[PDB]
Design a protein around this motif. Structure first.
Motif, PDB file in Angstrom:
ATOM      1  N   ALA A 101     -61.639  65.292  12.192  1.00 35.46           N
ATOM      2  CA  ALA A 101     -61.489  64.498  13.402  1.00 35.46           C
ATOM      3  C   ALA A 101     -61.161  65.418  14.573  1.00 35.46           C
ATOM      4  CB  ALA A 101     -60.365  63.477  13.230  1.00 35.46           C
ATOM      5  N   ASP A 158     -59.503  65.975  18.500  1.00 36.71           N
ATOM      6  CA  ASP A 158     -58.285  65.513  19.153  1.00 36.71           C
ATOM      7  C   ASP A 158     -58.541  64.162  19.823  1.00 36.71           C
ATOM      8  OD1 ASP A 158     -55.539  67.176  20.389  1.00 36.71           O
ATOM      9  OD2 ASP A 158     -56.168  65.252  21.247  1.00 36.71           O
ATOM     10  N   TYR A 172     -55.828  57.361  16.645  1.00 34.88           N
ATOM     11  CA  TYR A 172     -56.510  57.541  15.375  1.00 34.88           C
ATOM     12  C   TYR A 172     -56.607  56.256  14.553  1.00 34.88           C
ATOM     13  CZ  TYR A 172     -56.117  62.529  16.257  1.00 34.88           C
ATOM     14  OH  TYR A 172     -56.249  63.778  16.807  1.00 34.88           O
ATOM     15  N   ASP A 204     -50.544  60.378  16.498  1.00 35.57           N
ATOM     16  CA  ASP A 204     -50.154  61.447  15.592  1.00 35.57           C
ATOM     17  C   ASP A 204     -50.948  61.307  14.295  1.00 35.57           C
ATOM     18  OD1 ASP A 204     -48.919  63.460  14.211  1.00 35.57           O
ATOM     19  OD2 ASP A 204     -47.085  62.313  13.808  1.00 35.57           O
ATOM     20  N   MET A 205     -51.691  62.351  13.926  1.00 36.86           N
ATOM     21  CA  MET A 205     -52.506  62.279  12.709  1.00 36.86           C
ATOM     22  C   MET A 205     -51.638  62.208  11.455  1.00 36.86           C
ATOM     23  SD  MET A 205     -55.504  62.098  11.489  1.00 36.86           S
ATOM     24  CE  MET A 205     -56.825  62.921  12.356  1.00 36.86           C
ATOM     25  N   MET A 208     -52.076  59.441   8.522  1.00 36.11           N
ATOM     26  CA  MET A 208     -52.122  59.768   7.099  1.00 36.11           C
ATOM     27  C   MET A 208     -51.025  59.052   6.340  1.00 36.11           C
ATOM     28  SD  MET A 208     -54.747  61.490   6.699  1.00 36.11           S
ATOM     29  CE  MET A 208     -54.516  61.734   4.930  1.00 36.11           C
ATOM     30  N   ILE A 250     -61.459  73.944  12.855  1.00 39.39           N
ATOM     31  CA  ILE A 250     -61.677  72.557  13.249  1.00 39.39           C
ATOM     32  C   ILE A 250     -60.998  71.580  12.298  1.00 39.39           C
ATOM     33  CG2 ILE A 250     -63.909  73.154  14.310  1.00 39.39           C
ATOM     34  CD1 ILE A 250     -64.154  70.726  11.577  1.00 39.39           C
ATOM     35  N   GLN A 284     -58.313  69.343  10.685  1.00 38.94           N
ATOM     36  CA  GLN A 284     -57.040  68.747  11.068  1.00 38.94           C
ATOM     37  C   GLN A 284     -55.956  69.221  10.112  1.00 38.94           C
ATOM     38  OE1 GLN A 284     -55.634  66.535  13.253  1.00 38.94           O
ATOM     39  NE2 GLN A 284     -57.351  65.841  14.535  1.00 38.94           N
ATOM     40  N   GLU A 330     -52.813  68.540   9.796  1.00 41.69           N
ATOM     41  CA  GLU A 330     -51.908  67.563   9.189  1.00 41.69           C
ATOM     42  C   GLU A 330     -52.551  66.874   7.991  1.00 41.69           C
ATOM     43  OE1 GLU A 330     -50.517  65.363  12.875  1.00 41.69           O
ATOM     44  OE2 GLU A 330     -50.929  67.409  13.552  1.00 41.69           O
ATOM     45  N   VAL A 331     -53.877  66.725   7.998  1.00 45.87           N
ATOM     46  CA  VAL A 331     -54.554  66.153   6.838  1.00 45.87           C
ATOM     47  C   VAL A 331     -54.580  67.147   5.680  1.00 45.87           C
ATOM     48  CG1 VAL A 331     -56.533  64.844   6.075  1.00 45.87           C
ATOM     49  CG2 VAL A 331     -55.934  64.863   8.515  1.00 45.87           C
ATOM     50  N   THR A 335     -51.156  67.005   4.064  1.00 43.21           N
ATOM     51  CA  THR A 335     -50.911  65.867   3.178  1.00 43.21           C
ATOM     52  C   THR A 335     -51.635  66.048   1.844  1.00 43.21           C
ATOM     53  OG1 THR A 335     -52.591  64.609   4.433  1.00 43.21           O
ATOM     54  CG2 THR A 335     -50.310  64.238   4.998  1.00 43.21           C
TER      55      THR A 335
END
Lengths: 267, 267
Positions: free
Chosen positions: A150, A152, A156, A246-247, A251, B111, B113, B115-116, B119
């Motif tokens: 994804a 920015d 989301y 916030d990603m 999640m 590229i 993310q 934060e993903v 997790t």
């Protein structure tokens, strides 16, 4: 802060469609109490439908270019867009799913190594992973690739579509196998009461089940209903402080959804 | 089939280095029995070292451009390259780690993310995740971004570096806290016997531990030793049928590594 979705224009084209595939998606969309559709024009090359909202002023134009298989979506990314793309989502290839979920061209979900995204899904689903329907597995893996790449974005919230559509399919088949078919009128709601903020199965239907079945069906439907209602009714446009900017928070909702999906299969 | 690494030329530049950071990496590299290094030249702007293999003919030129902080690596991606980049890996930012692990410019790990990817790591590590050292957490997350965005390669074996370096650090601190310091001469080996294909702790050291400690230390060191030996000794160049051409197979090794890391922390 202000949510930018109502100032935005959508005009995108999705590949590989035939009319037989699009009709049920429009019909599913029109099951929402504030959504209706009609066919606007048809000739040998193109058929155009209009989806409108009977609450807020909003109209989405959907054009099937029959010769090329291209399905065009034009309008604003508000309620008709959210409803139509939700019901469309499970039909889309990776490129199409990314376009509807991030609303940009030139996304990069296609560079993600699919086998690595799959091992992510395998780990979270654990003993549920072999139970996944074909359509669910593909949607969740493609949805993971979209999350992983994804760009920015200010909001989301749409990236939870793969999980919510998946919950919908498993909830539907699970209730159906337990004597609770979900079909077009009334839908899920004929099976649930809603005291306070949570949906619980009505007593006559609960009385046929074991306590863990009762609990997972009620907690799954509550999560599906509340999360989808917020998306379909633009709750984060009306209240921009609720935008999922916030990603990590997105999640957090996705991992909760994965846990519900898992439980829906192992009960 | 033929492995293409010995026909390939490497000439890459890594950002943000000072000499104090590079010296220990060269010294660590020279702890291998077939690897030595020497300083070739030094002036006010540049210091050049040469890493050579005493077995197969191979020389890697490492140049620190002092004024710019750029560390240049030039040669073939064979044994000196594999050893130097292994010990370098934990020091690198995402861009640098990707360059050394995929050996291409214009990679796309940036590229993903983050934060993903985190997790993902949180799910696999489970109750070990809060125990991770800062350096390990960063290396594993960056390494996940590299796996997730890896281009199409004939051999993915190098993508296990983040896991193997992480096993090395946790194994070292765990044994050290249990009265088994690992230091420059002899190293790990002074603690292990090797009957058949597996390393087991020597009896005098096992006698101080509980059975689960004995088992995890032995299985961790065996995996680390065999996997790193195969990489450092170009086993998949000598035997191209062993190239990891399938990313699912690479992830199979990575998930095994994650399970060892987890166990190393929860014992």
């Amino acid at each position: 802060e202000i949510n930018p979705a109502e100032f935005e224009q959508v005009n995108m084209v999705l590949q590989g469609f035939v009319e037989t595939s699009v009709l049920p998606v429009l019909e599913l969309s029109a099951d929402e109490s504030h959504i209706e559709f009609r066919e606007h024009s048809r000739n040998a090359h193109t058929v155009v439908w209009k989806i409108i909202s009977t609450s807020y002023q909003d109209e989405l134009t959907v054009s099937l270019h029959i010769t090329t298989g291209k399905l065009q979506i034009q309008g604003r990314p508000l309620s008709c867009y959210r409803v139509f793309t939700f019901n469309l989502a499970a039909l889309l290839d990776l490129q199409g799913l990314e376009k509807v979920l991030i609303r940009q061209e030139d996304g990069k979900a296609n560079i993600v190594q699919q086998e690595v995204a799959r091992t992510y899904l395998q780990t979270v689903m654990a003993d549920a992973y072999p139970h996944l329907h074909v359509t669910a597995e593909k949607l969740l893996v493609s949805g993971l690739c979209v999350k992983l790449a994804a760009p920015d974005l200010p909001d989301y919230c749409m990236l939870l579509y793969p999980e919510l559509r998946t919950i919908e399919g498993v909830l539907k088949s699970k209730m159906s196998g337990l004597g609770m078919p979900v079909q077009q009128p009334a839908g899920f709601g004929t099976y649930f009461d809603k005291p306070a903020a949570h949906y619980i199965l009505k007593p006559q239907f609960a009385a046929t089940l074991r306590p863990e079945q009762i609990n997972i069906i009620s907690t799954a439907y509550t999560f599906f209903n509340v999360e989808r209602h917020s998306l379909f009714h633009m709750e984060t446009v009306v209240d921009a402080s609720r935008m999922i900017s916030d990603m990590a928070r997105l999640m957090g909702k996705a991992t909760r959804a994965w846990g519900i999906i898992k439980d829906l299969y192992i009960v």
